[PDB]
Structure formats: structure tokens, C-alpha cells
Tab-separated table of C-alpha atoms and ligand atoms in Angstrom:
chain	number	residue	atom	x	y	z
A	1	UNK	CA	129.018	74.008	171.479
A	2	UNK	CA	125.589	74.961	172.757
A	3	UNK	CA	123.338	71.805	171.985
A	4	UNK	CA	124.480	68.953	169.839
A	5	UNK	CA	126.018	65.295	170.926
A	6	UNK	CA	129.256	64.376	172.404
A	7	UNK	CA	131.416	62.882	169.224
A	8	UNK	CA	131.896	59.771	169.726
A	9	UNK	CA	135.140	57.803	168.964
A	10	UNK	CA	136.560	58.210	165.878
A	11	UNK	CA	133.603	61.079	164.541
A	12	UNK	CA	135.513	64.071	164.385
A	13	UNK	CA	139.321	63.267	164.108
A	14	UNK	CA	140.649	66.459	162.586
A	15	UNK	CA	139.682	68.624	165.592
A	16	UNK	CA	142.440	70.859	167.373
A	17	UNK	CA	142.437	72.634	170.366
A	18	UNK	CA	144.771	75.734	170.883
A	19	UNK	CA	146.397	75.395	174.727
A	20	UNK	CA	147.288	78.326	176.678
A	21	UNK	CA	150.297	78.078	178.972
A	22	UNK	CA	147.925	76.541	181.714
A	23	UNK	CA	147.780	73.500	179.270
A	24	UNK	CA	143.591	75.025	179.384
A	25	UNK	CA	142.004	75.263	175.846
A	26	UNK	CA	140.542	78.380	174.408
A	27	UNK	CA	139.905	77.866	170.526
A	28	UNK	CA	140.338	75.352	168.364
A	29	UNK	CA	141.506	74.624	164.830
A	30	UNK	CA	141.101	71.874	161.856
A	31	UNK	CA	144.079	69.205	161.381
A	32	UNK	CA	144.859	69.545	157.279
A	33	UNK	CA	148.106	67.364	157.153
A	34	UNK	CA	150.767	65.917	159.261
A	35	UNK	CA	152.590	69.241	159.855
A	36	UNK	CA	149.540	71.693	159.734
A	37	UNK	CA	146.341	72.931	161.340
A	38	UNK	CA	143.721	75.533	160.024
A	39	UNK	CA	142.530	78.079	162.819
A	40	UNK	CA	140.921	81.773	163.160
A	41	UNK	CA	143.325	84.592	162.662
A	42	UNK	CA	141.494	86.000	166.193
A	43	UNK	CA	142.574	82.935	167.847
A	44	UNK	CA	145.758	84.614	168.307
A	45	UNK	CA	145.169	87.383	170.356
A	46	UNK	CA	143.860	85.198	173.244
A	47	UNK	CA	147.287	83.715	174.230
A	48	UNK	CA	150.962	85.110	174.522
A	49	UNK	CA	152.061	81.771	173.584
A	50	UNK	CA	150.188	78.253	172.964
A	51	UNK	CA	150.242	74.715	171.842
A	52	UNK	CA	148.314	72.204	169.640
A	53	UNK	CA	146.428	69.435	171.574
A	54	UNK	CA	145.452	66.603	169.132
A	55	UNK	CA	143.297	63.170	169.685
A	56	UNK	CA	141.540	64.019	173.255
A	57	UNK	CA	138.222	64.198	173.090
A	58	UNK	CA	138.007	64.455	176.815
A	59	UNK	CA	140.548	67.300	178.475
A	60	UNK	CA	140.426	65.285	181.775
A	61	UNK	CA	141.596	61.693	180.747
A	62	UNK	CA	144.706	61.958	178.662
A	63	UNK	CA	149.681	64.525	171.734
A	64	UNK	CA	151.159	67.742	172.555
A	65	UNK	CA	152.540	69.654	169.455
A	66	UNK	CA	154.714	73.372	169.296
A	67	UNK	CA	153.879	76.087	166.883
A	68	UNK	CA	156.593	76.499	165.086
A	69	UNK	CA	155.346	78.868	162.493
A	70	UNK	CA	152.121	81.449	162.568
A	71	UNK	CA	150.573	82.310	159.426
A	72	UNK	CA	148.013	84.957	160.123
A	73	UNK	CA	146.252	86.748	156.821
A	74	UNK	CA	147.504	90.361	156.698
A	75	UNK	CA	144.637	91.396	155.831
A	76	UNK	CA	142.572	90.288	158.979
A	77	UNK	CA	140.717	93.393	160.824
A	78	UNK	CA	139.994	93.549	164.400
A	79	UNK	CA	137.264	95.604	163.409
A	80	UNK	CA	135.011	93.577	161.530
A	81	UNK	CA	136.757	90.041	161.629
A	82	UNK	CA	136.777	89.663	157.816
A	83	UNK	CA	140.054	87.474	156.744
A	84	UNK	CA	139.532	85.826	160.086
A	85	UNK	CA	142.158	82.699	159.710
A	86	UNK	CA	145.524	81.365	160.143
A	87	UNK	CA	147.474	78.638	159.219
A	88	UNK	CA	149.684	77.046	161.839
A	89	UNK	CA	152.721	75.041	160.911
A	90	UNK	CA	153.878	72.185	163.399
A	91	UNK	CA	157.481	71.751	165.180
A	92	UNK	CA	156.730	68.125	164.918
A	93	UNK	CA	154.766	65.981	162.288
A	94	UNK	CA	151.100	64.780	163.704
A	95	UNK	CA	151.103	61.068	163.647
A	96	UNK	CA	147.949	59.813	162.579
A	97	UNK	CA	145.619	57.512	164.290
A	98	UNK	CA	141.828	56.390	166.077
A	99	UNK	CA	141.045	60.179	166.582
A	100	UNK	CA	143.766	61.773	164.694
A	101	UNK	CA	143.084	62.618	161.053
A	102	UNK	CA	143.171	65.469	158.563
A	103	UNK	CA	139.615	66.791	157.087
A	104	UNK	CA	140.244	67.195	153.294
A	105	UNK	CA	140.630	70.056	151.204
A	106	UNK	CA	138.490	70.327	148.790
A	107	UNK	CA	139.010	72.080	144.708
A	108	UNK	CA	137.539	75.534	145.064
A	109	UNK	CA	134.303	75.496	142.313
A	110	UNK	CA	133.409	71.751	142.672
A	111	UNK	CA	133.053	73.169	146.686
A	112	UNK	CA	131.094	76.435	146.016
A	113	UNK	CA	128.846	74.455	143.403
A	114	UNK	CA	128.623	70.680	145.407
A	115	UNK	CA	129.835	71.659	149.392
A	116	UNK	CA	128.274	74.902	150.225
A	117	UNK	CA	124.928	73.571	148.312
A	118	UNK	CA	124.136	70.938	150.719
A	119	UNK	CA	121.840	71.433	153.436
A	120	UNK	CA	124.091	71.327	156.385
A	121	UNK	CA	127.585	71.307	157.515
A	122	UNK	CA	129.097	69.794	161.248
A	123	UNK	CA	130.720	72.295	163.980
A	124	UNK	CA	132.564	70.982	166.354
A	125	UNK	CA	134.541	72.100	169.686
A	126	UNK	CA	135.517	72.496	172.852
A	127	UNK	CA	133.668	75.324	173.849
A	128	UNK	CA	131.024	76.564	175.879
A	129	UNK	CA	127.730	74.573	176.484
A	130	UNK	CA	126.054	77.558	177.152
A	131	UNK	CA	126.683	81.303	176.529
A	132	UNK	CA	127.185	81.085	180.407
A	133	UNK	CA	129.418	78.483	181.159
A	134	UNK	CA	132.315	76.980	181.358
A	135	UNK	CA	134.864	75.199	178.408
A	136	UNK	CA	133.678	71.417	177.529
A	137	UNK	CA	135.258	69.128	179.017
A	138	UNK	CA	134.404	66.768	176.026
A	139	UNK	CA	134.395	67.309	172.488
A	140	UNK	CA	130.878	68.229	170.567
A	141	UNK	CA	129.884	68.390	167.616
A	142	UNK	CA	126.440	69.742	165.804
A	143	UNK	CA	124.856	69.801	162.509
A	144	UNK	CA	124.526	73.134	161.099
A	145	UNK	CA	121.855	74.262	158.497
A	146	UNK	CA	123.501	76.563	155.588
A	147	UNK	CA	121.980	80.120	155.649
A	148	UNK	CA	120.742	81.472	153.106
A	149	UNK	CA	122.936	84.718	152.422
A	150	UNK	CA	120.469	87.510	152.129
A	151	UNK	CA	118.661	85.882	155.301
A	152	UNK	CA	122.016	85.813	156.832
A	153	UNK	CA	122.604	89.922	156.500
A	154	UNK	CA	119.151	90.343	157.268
A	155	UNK	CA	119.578	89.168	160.897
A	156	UNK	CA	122.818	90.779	161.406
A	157	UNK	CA	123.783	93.254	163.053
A	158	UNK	CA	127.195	93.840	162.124
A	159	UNK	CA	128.736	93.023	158.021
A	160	UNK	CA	128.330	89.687	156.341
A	161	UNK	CA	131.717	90.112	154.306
A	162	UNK	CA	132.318	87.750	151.109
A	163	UNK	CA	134.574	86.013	153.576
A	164	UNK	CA	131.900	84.412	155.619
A	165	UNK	CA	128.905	82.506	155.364
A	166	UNK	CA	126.241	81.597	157.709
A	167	UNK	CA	125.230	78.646	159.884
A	168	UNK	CA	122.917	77.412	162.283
A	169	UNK	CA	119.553	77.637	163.585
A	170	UNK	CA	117.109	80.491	164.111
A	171	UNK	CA	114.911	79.568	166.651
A	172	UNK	CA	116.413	76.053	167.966
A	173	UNK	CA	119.008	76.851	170.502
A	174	UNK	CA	122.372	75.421	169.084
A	175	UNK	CA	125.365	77.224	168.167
A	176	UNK	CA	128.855	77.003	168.359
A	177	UNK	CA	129.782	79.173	171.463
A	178	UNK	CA	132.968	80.585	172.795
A	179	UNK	CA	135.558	78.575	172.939
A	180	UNK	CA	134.779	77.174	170.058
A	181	UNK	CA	136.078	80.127	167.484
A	182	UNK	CA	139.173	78.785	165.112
A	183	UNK	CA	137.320	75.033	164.826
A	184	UNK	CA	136.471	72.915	162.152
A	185	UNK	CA	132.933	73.709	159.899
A	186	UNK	CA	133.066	70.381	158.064
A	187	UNK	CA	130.695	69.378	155.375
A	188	UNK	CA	129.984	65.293	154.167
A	189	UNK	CA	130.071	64.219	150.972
A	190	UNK	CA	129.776	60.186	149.849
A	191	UNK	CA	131.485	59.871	153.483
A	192	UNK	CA	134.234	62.184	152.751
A	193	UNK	CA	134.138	64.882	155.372
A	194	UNK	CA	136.078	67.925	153.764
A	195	UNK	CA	136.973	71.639	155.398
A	196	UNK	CA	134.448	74.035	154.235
A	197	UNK	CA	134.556	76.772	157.259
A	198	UNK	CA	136.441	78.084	160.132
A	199	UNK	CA	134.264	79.170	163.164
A	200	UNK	CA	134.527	82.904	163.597
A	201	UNK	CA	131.953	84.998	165.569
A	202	UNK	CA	128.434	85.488	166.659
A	203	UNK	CA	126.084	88.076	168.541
A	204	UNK	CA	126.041	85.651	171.480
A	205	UNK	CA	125.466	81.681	171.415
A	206	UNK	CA	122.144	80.519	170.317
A	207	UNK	CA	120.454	83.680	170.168
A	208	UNK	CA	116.930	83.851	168.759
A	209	UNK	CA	117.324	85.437	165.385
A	210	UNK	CA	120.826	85.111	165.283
A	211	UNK	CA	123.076	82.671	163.396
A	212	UNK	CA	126.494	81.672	163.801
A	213	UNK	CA	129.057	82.898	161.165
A	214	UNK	CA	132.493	81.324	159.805
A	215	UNK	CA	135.041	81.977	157.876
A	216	UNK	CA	134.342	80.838	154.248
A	217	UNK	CA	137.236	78.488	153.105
A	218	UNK	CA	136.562	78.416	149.797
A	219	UNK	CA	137.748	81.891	149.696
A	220	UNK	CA	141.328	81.116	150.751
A	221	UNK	CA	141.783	77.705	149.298
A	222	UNK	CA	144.879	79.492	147.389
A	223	UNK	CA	145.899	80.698	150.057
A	224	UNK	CA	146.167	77.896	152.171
A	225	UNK	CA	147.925	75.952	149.504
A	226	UNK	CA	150.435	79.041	149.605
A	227	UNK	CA	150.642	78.791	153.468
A	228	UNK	CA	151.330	75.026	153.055
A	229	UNK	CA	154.210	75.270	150.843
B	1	UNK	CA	120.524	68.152	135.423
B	2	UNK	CA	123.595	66.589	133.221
B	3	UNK	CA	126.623	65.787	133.686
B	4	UNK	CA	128.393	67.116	137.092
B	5	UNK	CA	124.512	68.162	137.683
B	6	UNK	CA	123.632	64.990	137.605
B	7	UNK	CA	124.763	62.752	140.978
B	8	UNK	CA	128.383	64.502	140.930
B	9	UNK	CA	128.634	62.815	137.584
B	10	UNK	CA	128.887	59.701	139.820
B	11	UNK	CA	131.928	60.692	140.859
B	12	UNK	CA	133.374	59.734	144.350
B	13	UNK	CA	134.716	63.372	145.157
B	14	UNK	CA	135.264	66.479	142.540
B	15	UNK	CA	133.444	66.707	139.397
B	16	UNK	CA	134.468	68.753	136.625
B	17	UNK	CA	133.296	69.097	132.884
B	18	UNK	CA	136.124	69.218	129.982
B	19	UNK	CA	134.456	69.844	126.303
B	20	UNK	CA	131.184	68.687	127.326
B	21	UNK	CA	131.878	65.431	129.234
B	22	UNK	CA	132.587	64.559	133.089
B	23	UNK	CA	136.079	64.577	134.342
B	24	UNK	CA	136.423	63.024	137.973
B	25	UNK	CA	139.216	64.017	140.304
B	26	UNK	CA	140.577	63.621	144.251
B	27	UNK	CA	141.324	64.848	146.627
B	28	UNK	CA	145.801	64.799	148.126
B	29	UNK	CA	145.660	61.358	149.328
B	30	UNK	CA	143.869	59.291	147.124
B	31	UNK	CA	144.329	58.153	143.832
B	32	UNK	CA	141.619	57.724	140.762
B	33	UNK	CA	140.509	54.471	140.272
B	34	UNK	CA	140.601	52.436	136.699
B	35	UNK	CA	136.999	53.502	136.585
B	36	UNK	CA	137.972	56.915	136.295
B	37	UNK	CA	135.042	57.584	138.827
B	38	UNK	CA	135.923	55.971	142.692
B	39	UNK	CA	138.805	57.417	144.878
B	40	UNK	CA	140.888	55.059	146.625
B	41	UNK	CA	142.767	55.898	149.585
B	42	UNK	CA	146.570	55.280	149.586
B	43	UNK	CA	147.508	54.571	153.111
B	44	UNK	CA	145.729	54.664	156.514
B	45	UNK	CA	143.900	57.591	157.604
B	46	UNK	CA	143.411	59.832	154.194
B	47	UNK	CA	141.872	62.989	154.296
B	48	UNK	CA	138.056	63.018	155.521
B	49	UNK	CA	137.432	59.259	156.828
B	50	UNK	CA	136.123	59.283	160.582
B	51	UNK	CA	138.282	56.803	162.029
B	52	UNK	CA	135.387	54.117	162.861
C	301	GSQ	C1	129.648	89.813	167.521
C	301	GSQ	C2	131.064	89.290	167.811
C	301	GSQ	C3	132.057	90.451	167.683
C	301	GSQ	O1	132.269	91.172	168.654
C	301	GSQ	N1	132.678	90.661	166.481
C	301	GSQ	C4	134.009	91.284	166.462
C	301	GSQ	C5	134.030	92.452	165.467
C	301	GSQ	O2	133.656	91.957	164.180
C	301	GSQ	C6	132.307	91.492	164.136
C	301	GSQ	C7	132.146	90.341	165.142
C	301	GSQ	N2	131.076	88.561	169.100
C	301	GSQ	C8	130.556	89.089	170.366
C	301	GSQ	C9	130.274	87.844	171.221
C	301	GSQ	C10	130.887	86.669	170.439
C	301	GSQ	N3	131.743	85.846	171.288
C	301	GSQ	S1	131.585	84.243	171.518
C	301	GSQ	O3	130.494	84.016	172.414
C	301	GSQ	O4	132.915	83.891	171.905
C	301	GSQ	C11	131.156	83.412	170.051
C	301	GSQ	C12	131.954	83.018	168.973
C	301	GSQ	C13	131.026	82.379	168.101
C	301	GSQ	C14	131.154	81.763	166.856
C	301	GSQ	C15	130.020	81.207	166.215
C	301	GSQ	CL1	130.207	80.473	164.642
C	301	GSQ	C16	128.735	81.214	166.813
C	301	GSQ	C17	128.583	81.832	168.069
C	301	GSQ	C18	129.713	82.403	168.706
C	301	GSQ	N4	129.856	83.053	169.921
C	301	GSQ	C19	131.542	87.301	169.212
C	301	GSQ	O5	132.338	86.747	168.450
């Protein structure tokens, strides 16, 4: 996360970070119940075999969870990162507590019509502070304008699917960053914070003219109900 | 603006209309209150709630 404030205890309890075998975290991922976590279908590629760190906020003052099954949409293309999401399902149930908490689901047309209407949505992650840089060391998270869609494709320079939706800011320099991919895109409502993207790609971090794009979760809301079943 | 237009139809979390009027539902986690409008959480830590 390029920009944006530390969270703070208790703020963002539903993050996950993905763990290489070097315990060293390279995406994250959204806690939706006891036994499973929401991440990018990309995320997958960038380990042989990884974990599920839940709680920390900071990597360097210390729960551990295995994968125990990978649900990757067959449709996702390498290509053009459309379908970019997985669903992970836990060895071990997540217990819940200060820091550890699922972001809701929300119903699919109440979210299109009440969720993606509202002015911004919250990133958060591990990632980058700065397109050059190293992984955070402590969890971030930022407030993300909603794009407007045909001002979305507009800047782009590569496909704005049905799949995705746009974030961020066009001249202020905050964006999700690597690092970051697979996280949580939350959006508040009445003090409800429910899952409303999954962070996917952009043409750089923070980029003048450029906005960050996720994966749209209302699209796969079936899906994920499938995946959790 | 009427009914879900209007406020969510002052419901707590999803709004839906049935034959013209508001139905109020949550979401896994919480059940409706007598009001038919609030959402009430039915343990620790339900879905959404920072843990302040
Ligand atoms: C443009 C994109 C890319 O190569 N794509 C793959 C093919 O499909 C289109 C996107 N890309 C190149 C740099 C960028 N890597 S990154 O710095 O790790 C990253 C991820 C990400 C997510 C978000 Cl939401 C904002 C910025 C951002 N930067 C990335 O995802």
C-alpha cells in the first residue's frame, strides 16, 4: 500500500497474508469464515507451496494455518487476468478474535445497487510502500474512490473486463502496490464492513492517470457460495 | 427515492422490495430483529465488525 495509515488495532481484522516457504508474505487474501479465505487466482503462481498468516498486523512481532484445498476459477487467463480469484479452504478452523474476523458477504443486487454506489471502498495489505520498495512490515490500509467505469477504460491500457472495477486516485499518489494483489477491497455500510473486491493488477503503483483495478465480487458471489460448500 | 431508495429502507444491512413494500434481510451471522429492520449479531465477532 502506497500512501494510506497503518490500521490500527482491531480496523481491518479479515486481512490474510499468503506465506511462502520462507514464512515471507507475498499476497494477501480476505478471511470469509472460520475455514475459508478469499484471494486472487494469480496469487498462486508466486509460490510452490504457502500458508495463511492471520491476526499480525506487524510481520516482526508475532496463527499459522495450511491450505488444505485450492479453488482457483477455471476460467482465469494469464493473459488478461479476468476471473482473477480463488477460494482457499483451511486444514484448521480460524479462531476468531481482537484482529481476527471475517468481512461479510454481501446479497448480490442489494451490493451492485447499495455497495458499489458509495463513494469509496478500503484496500488493505502488506505490500509495497512504494512501487520501489520493499514488503510492509505493518499492515495498511487506504480509502479508495470508486471509478467511474467508462473513466476507468479510458485510462487503461490493457481490458476493463465485466470482472473488474476500478479504484483509486488519479492524481494523488495512493494505490495498492505489489504485494498487495489477492487482499481485501472492503466497502462500509451502517458499520458493517462487507467484501466487495479482490485486489488484482495495475500499470504500476500510484501512477498518474492510472487507477488500481480488482476483481469485482459481486460477479462471483455464486460462486463463492459454491466454493464454500 | 422510495422504499429501498430511500435510506436502505432503514434497514440495518440488505434491502429488498416484495409487491411494492420493503423487505429487510442479513447477512450469515446475524439474525433479524422483532423490528423486522436491525440485525443483531449472534455470537462474538460476526461478519464485518472491526474488533474495537
Ligand atoms: C498491468 C499488470 C499486468 O501485467 N497485467 C497482467 C495481464 O493482464 C492485465 C494486467 N501489472 C504490471 C505491474 C503490476 N504489478 S504490481 O506492481 O504488483 C501491482 C498490483 C496492483 C494491484 C492494484 Cl489494485 C493496484 C496497483 C498494483 N500494482 C501488474 O499487475
Amino acid at each position: 500500500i502506497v500512501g494510506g495509515q497503518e490500521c490500527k488495532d482491531g480496523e481491518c481484522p479479515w486481512q490474510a497474508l499468503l506465506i511462502n516457504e520462507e514464512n515471507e508474505g507475498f499476497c494477501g487474501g480476505t478471511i470469509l469464515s472460520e475455514f475459508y479465505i478469499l484471494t486472487a487466482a494469480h496469487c498462486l503462481y508466486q509460490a510452490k507451496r504457502f500458508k495463511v498468516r492471520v491476526g499480525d498486523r506487524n510481520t516482526e512481532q508475532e496463527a499459522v494455518h495450511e491450505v488444505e484445498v485450492v479453488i482457483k476459477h477455471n476460467r482465469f487467463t494469464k493473459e488478461t487476468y479476468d476471473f482473477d480469484i480463488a477460494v482457499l479452504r483451511l486444514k484448521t478452523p480460524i479462531t476468531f478474535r481482537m484482529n481476527v474476523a471475517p468481512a461479510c458477504l454481501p446479497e448480490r443486487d442489494w451490493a451492485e445497487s447499495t455497495l458499489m454506489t458509495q463513494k469509496t471502498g478500503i484496500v488493505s495489505g502488506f505490500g509495497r510502500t512504494h512501487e520501489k520498495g520493499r514488503q510492509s512490515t505493518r499492515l495498511k490500509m487506504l480509502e479508495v474512490p470508486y471509478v467511474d467505469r467508462n473513466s476507468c477504460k479510458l485510462s487503461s491500457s490493457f481490458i476493463i473486463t465485466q470482472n473488474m472495477f476500478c479504484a483509486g486516485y488519479d492524481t494523488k499518489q495512493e494505490d495498492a502496490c505489489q504485494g498487495d494483489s489477492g487482499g481485501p477491497h472492503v466497502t462500509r455500510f451502517k458499520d458493517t464492513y462487507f467484501v466487495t473486491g479482490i485486489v488484482s493488477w495495475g500499470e504500476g503503483c500510484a501512477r498518474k492517470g492510472k487507477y488500481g483495478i480488482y476483481t469485482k465480487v459481486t460477479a462471483f458471489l455464486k460462486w463463492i457460495d459454491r466454493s464454500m460448500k | 427515492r422510495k422504499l429501498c431508495s430511500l435510506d436502505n429502507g432503514d434497514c440495518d444491512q440488505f434491502c429488498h422490495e416484495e409487491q411494492n413494500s420493503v423487505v429487510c434481510s442479513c447477512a450469515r451471522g446475524y439474525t433479524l430483529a422483532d423490528n423486522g429492520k436491525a440485525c443483531i449479531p449472534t455470537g462474538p465477532y460476526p461478519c464485518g465488525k472491526q474488533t474495537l
